[PDB]
Amino acid sequence: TGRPEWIWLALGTALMGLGTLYFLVKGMGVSDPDAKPFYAITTLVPAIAFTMYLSMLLGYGLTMVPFGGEQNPIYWARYADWLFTTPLLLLDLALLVDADQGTILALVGADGIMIGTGLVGALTKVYSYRFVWWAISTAAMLYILYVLFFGFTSKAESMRPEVASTFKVLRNVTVVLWSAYPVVWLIGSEGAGIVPLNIETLLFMVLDVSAKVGFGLILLRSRAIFG
C-alpha cells in the first residue's frame, strides 16, 4: 500500500528484532538461575513487539473506524502488543523490589483495564465517547505510575544501593515514556487527528523501542539482576 508510515514500521521491526536477539543470546549464556526470570521476561518484550510490528508492516493490525465524518485508520495491532508487553515490563520492576503478590496482581489488572478501555475507545464510532474511554484508560495508567513511584520506590529501599539505584532509573524511564502515550493518542489519529498518521507512528516507535529495548539494556546490563 506504500502508506506514508511503513518506514517507521520497518524500523521498529528492525530495532525490536535486534534487541530481541541480543537479549536472547545474552540471557541463554547466563548460568545464574535467579537471573533467568529477568532475561526471559525482558527478551519476551522485544519479541512480541517485533511480531506485531512485522504484521502491521505487512498490512495487518489495521482497521478503518468511522467518526468525525471521516473513515479513520486505526492500527489496533498496537493493543495486541501492549496487552502483553506492558504488564511484563511491570513484572520486571515488581521482581526487582521484592514486590508483594497482591501488588503485582493489582498492577497487572489496572494495566489490563488501561489497554482494554484503550482499544475500545480507539474503536468507538461516537467521537466524543472515544475520549470517554481514553479518559478511563489514562486514569488506570496514573494508578500504575502512582504505585511505581510511591510504593515500589519505597520497597527498593530494603535492597542494596545497587538494586535501589537500578530501579530508580527504570522507574524514571518508565514514568517519562508511559506518560507520553496518552498525549500521543489524544492529538493523533485515535483522537483529534491533529498529528498525521505518519508522524504518530514515528512517535510510537521511539517510545515503544525506548521503553522496551532501552529498558531491557539498562536492566540486563546492571548487576542488580543477580538476586
Please give the residue ranges that form the binding site for ligand RET (CB under 6 A). Answer: 49, 82, 85-86, 89, 114-115, 118, 134, 137-138, 141, 178, 181-182, 185, 208, 211-212
Spatial neighbors of 31 by CB under 8 A, at least 6 apart, are none
Nearest to ligand RET by Cβ — which residue? 118
- Angle, nearest 10°, between helix axes 101-123 and 77-96? 160
Whether the CB-CB separation of 124 and 130 falls below 8 Å is answered with: yes
Nearer to ligand RET, 49 or 156 (CB): 49
- Angle, nearest 10°, between helix axes 197-221 and 77-96? 20
At 220, the amino acid letter reads L
Least distance between ligand RET and beta carbon 176 (Å) = 11
Nearer to ligand RET, 129 or 226 (CB): 129
Nearer to ligand RET, 30 or 62 (CB): 62
3-state secondary structure of 194: coil
Least distance between ligand RET and beta carbon 115 (Å) = 5
Least distance between ligand RET and beta carbon 101 (Å) = 22
Residue with cell string 539494556: 217
Nearer to ligand RET, 74 or 156 (CB): 74
- Cα separation of 227 and 223, whole Å? 9
Residue with cell string 506504500: 2
Residue with cell string 489497554: 115
3-state secondary structure of 42: helix
Nearer to ligand RET, 115 or 170 (CB): 115
